[PDB]
RNA sequence: GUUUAUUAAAAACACAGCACUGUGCAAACACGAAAGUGGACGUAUACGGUGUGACGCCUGCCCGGUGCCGGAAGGUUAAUU
């Protein structure tokens, strides 16, 4: 049972639907007895360099405390989800709640 | 696994077997078989239209589901069993609705594994989906060429197809031969590669082994007489001719594809 | 060959004009349709007999097609359901068949082959504009609402 | 300790071309530079910072 | 049976002469094509194996007229 | 193991192995005026052709000639007009 910090990038065209992603993902973590300690929706932002001919993407920051299996299938969801791009997951030794 | 035979006698010195303990040791599924009488290379006129075919072990055909139209009904792999009709193994799968069928065994599939076919099936080996739903770059086998016609590409033991790109209503596929081909995205494909990848490493080891699988001896053209083959005779070992088929067509370089119908789907040839 | 047009044609002519066309064009398209028939003295005199009737008949069908066109536009929105996955990306598709049936359902009889979808086949959930070509010179529009739970 | 999301501070430790500034110039401690190097490389992956001034 | 159903054209034999006038037997085959003709009088298509010349006969004589001759001759369509 | 039934059983043929080459499936190819059939109810770890001939260590230099493959600007060039 390990902490994680998850940052995933959503396609700008799906910006309005981004809140749909968060509820589904949080449900998966909670459904497996996990919990979410921080959750930020940074919204649209300018990319430093183009990514697949795209210059502006929707930013979501989520910090969770879920078991290994929950994160494993969560990565698979990002892999096959075309809306989300360039997602990464972290390992942390303590939960975080600051805005940063 | 692949195991070499000890040289207890000539004919076993070079034999290399491919032993798979997972294959079912019993008889196949009876109500899914049919007669597969041999031909010997003869056509309906009785003439030998293809040489070096004849004899071999008796074989019974077993219906393999290349289409997999059972949409939305999951199935469990009952067992993997030997198939004499092809290099690859076939897995017996039981649909929970009560139906049984054969499918080409993927690389990693094992007894008890869940599989499902349909447009909403999960992206997992053994599942069949239209290529418009499969992610680009996925490794697939048993690829269809026309919707509803059944898989026709990547059926051999260790063959697979890569979805290099997708555009419009077509998906570009890199075939095992290296050729890049266009196919309609609505065609179905099975995720993963075909199992039994160790099929190429086997060594027959003796002439009789080839005969068991219905391959007759091949006689070199240069060993014949002029009346029999262009390479003909000549006292001593004389060739002095450009290599050709028994019917005079040049070999070792000459192209033979003449299908003007299907070049529109061939973005790039194998080489 | 020389043919006389029984109906208005975009780039060829109007009713009653004798025009020269390729044999394939007349044999394969015009003659099988009601657009034109071979121009011969037997047909020319016979055509003249109902010259007024054909023009009157063609005039009202355009109005009749227009009449049924507006009521199609009355159903400005039509709701249909399909297999929609996560992200709203439809696993399946909604072709001309599904759209054709929907408009008639509690609506007006609509042919399955005259619906126009220039953008595509509506492979994604949302709102899309589908054009309707009911008669050669008139068009119709309607919004198809596609959503699923 | 130092977090990569804090881009404002990271801007001070990268040249106009995106190069990571040497420790001898900034004068940061060796331990923090290793964290700094990871942070800058990590922001670059998320495109929070540019790999280079040319793109 | 490479025989046109309308005109009755069938393959004929002949020779091909080389520059040295060597004579070898050959055949001349009609330009047959299977085509669907719409019978205006019957609201249906009729498939006929006709040569290119037969196709032009349809235009000049009309599909209705020829079918009467085919029916009289006993040809099945 | 095979072979000149009836003067030649061998160093010849075959052979497992090896290499080149063709073939994307209505495959190449082959028997057929054609339909169609085999290849194959197989799908490039497949199939056809060619040479070599277990295995061990190896297989060097030559693309002028002939063949094959790729190219197309230029020259020459058929029916047709
Ligand atoms: Mg042979
Ligand atoms: Mg051989
Ligand atoms: Mg000899
Ligand atoms: Mg000699
Ligand atoms: Mg002996
Ligand atoms: Mg003898
Ligand atoms: Mg030899």
Swiss-Prot record, chain A:
One of its GO terms (biological process) is cytoplasmic translation. GO terms for cellular component: cytoplasm; cytosol; cytosolic small ribosomal subunit. The modification N6-acetyllysine is found at residue 93. Keywords: Acetylation, Ribonucleoprotein, Ribosomal protein, RNA-binding, rRNA-binding. GO terms for molecular function: mRNA 5'-UTR binding; small ribosomal subunit rRNA binding; structural constituent of ribosome. 5 different forms of the protein, varying only in the number of C-terminal glutamate residues, were isolated. The sequence shown is form bS6-6, which is the longest. The first two Glu are encoded by the rpsF gene, the other Glu are added post-translationally by the RimK enzyme. Part of the 30S ribosomal subunit. Interacts weakly with uL2 in one of the 3.5 A resolved structures. Binds together with bS18 to 16S ribosomal RNA. Belongs to the bacterial ribosomal protein bS6 family. This is Small ribosomal subunit protein bS6. The gene is rpsF.
From Swiss-Prot, chain B:
Keywords: Acetylation, Ribonucleoprotein, Ribosomal protein, RNA-binding, rRNA-binding. GO terms for biological process: cytoplasmic translation; negative regulation of DNA-templated DNA replication initiation; ribosomal large subunit assembly. The keyword RNA-binding applies. Residues 27-52, 220-271 are annotated as: Disordered. PROSITE patterns: RIBOSOMAL_L2. It comes from the Bacteria. The keyword Cell inner membrane does not apply. One of its GO terms (molecular function) is RNA binding. The modification N6-acetyllysine is found at residue 241. Residues 38-47 have a biased composition (Low complexity). GO terms for cellular component: cytoplasm; cytosol; cytosolic large ribosomal subunit; DnaA-L2 complex. HAMAP family: Ribosomal_uL2_B. This protein can be partially replaced in vivo by its H.marismortui (HmaL2) or human (L8, from the 60S cytoplasmic ribosome) homolog. Part of the 50S ribosomal subunit. Forms a bridge to the 30S subunit in the 70S ribosome, contacting the 16S rRNA. Interacts weakly with S6 in one of the 3.5 A resolved structures. In pull-down experiments interacts with CedA. One of the primary rRNA binding proteins. Located near the base of the L1 stalk, it is probably also mobile. Required for association of the 30S and 50S subunits to form the 70S ribosome, for tRNA binding and peptide bond formation. It has been suggested to have peptidyltransferase activity; this is highly controversial. In the E.coli 70S ribosome in the initiation state it has been modeled to make several contacts with the 16S rRNA (forming bridge B7b, PubMed:12809609); these contacts are broken in the model with bound EF-G. Belongs to the universal ribosomal protein uL2 family. This is Large ribosomal subunit protein uL2. It comes from Escherichia coli (strain K12). The gene is rplB.
């Amino acid at each position: 049972m390990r902490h994680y910090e998850i940052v995933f990038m959503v396609h700008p065209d799906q910006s309005e639907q981004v809140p749909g992603m968060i509820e589904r993902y949080t449900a998966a973590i909670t459904g497996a007895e996990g919990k979410i300690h921080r959750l930020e929706d940074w919204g649209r932002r300018q990319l430093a360099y183009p990514i697949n001919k795209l210059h502006k993407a929707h930013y979501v920051l989520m910090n969770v405390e879920a078991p290994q299996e929950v994160i494993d299938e969560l990565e698979t969801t990002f892999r096959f989800n075309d809306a989300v791009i360039r997602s990464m997951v972290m390992r942390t030794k303590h939960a975080v709640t600051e805005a940063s | 696994a692949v195991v070499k035979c000890k040289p207890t006698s000539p004919g076993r010195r070079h034999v290399v077997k491919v032993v798979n303990p997972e294959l079912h040791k019993g008889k196949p599924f009876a109500p899914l078989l049919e007669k597969n009488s041999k031909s010997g290379g003869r056509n309906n006129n009785g003439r030998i239209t293809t040489r070096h075919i004849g004899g071999g072990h008796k074989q019974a055909y077993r219906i393999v589901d290349f289409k997999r139209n059972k949409d939305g009904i999951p199935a469990v792999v009952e067992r993997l069993e030997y198939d004499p009709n092809r290099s690859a193994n076939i897995a017996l799968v039981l649909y929970k609705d009560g139906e049984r069928r054969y499918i080409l065994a993927p690389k990693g599939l094992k007894a008890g594994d869940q599989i499902q076919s349909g447009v909403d099936a999960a992206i997992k080996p053994g599942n069949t989906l239209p290529m418009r739903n499969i992610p680009v770059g996925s490794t697939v086998h048993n690829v269809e060429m026309k919707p509803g016609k059944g898989g026709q590409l990547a059926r051999s033991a260790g063959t697979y197809v890569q979805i290099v790109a997708r555009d419009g209503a077509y998906v570009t596929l890199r075939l095992r031969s290296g050729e890049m081909r266009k196919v309609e995205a609505d065609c179905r494909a099975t995720l993963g590669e075909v199992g039994n990848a160790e099929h190429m490493l086997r060594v027959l080891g003796k002439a009789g082994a080839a005969r068991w699988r219905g391959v007759r001896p091949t006689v070199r053209g240069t060993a014949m007489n002029p009346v029999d083959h262009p390479h003909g005779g000549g006292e001593g070992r004389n060739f002095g001719k450009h290599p050709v088929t028994p019917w005079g067509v040049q070999t070792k370089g000459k192209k033979t594809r003449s299908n003007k119908r299907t070049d529109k789907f061939i973005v790039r040839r194998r080489s | 060959m020389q043919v006389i047009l029984l109906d208005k044609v975009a780039n060829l002519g109007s009713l009653g004009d004798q025009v020269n066309v390729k044999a394939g064009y007349a044999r394969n398209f015009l003659v099988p349709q009601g657009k034109a028939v071979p121009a011969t003295k037997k047909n020319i005199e016979f055509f003249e007999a109902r010259r007024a009737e054909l023009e009157a008949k063609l005039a009202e069908v355009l109005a009749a097609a227009n009449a049924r066109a507006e009521k199609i536009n009355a159903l400005e929105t039509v709701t249909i359901a399909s297999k929609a996955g996560d992200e709203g990306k439809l696993f399946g598709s909604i072709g001309t068949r599904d759209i054709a049936d929907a408009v008639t359902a509690a609506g007006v009889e609509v042919a399955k082959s005259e619906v126009r979808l220039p953008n595509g086949v509506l492979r994604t959930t949302g709102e899309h504009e589908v054009s309707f070509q009911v008669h050669s010179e008139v068009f119709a529009k309607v919004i198809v609402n596609v959503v699923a739970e | 300790e130092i977090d990569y999301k804090d881009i404002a501070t990271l801007k001070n430790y990268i040249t106009e071309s995106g190069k990571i500034v040497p420790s001898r110039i900034t004068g940061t401690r060796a331990k923090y530079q290793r964290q700094l190097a990871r942070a800058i490389k990590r922001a670059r992956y998320l495109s929070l910072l540019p790999y280079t001034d040319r793109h | 049976s490479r025989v046109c159903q309308v005109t009755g054209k069938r393959p004929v034999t002949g020779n091909n002469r080389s520059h040295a006038l060597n004579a070898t037997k050959r055949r001349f085959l009609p330009n047959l094509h299977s085509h669907r003709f719409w019978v205006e009088s019957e609201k249906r298509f009729v498939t006929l194996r006709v040569s290119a010349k037969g196709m032009r006969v349809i235009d000049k004589k009309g599909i209705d007229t020829v079918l009467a001759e085919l029916r009289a001759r006993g040809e099945k369509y």
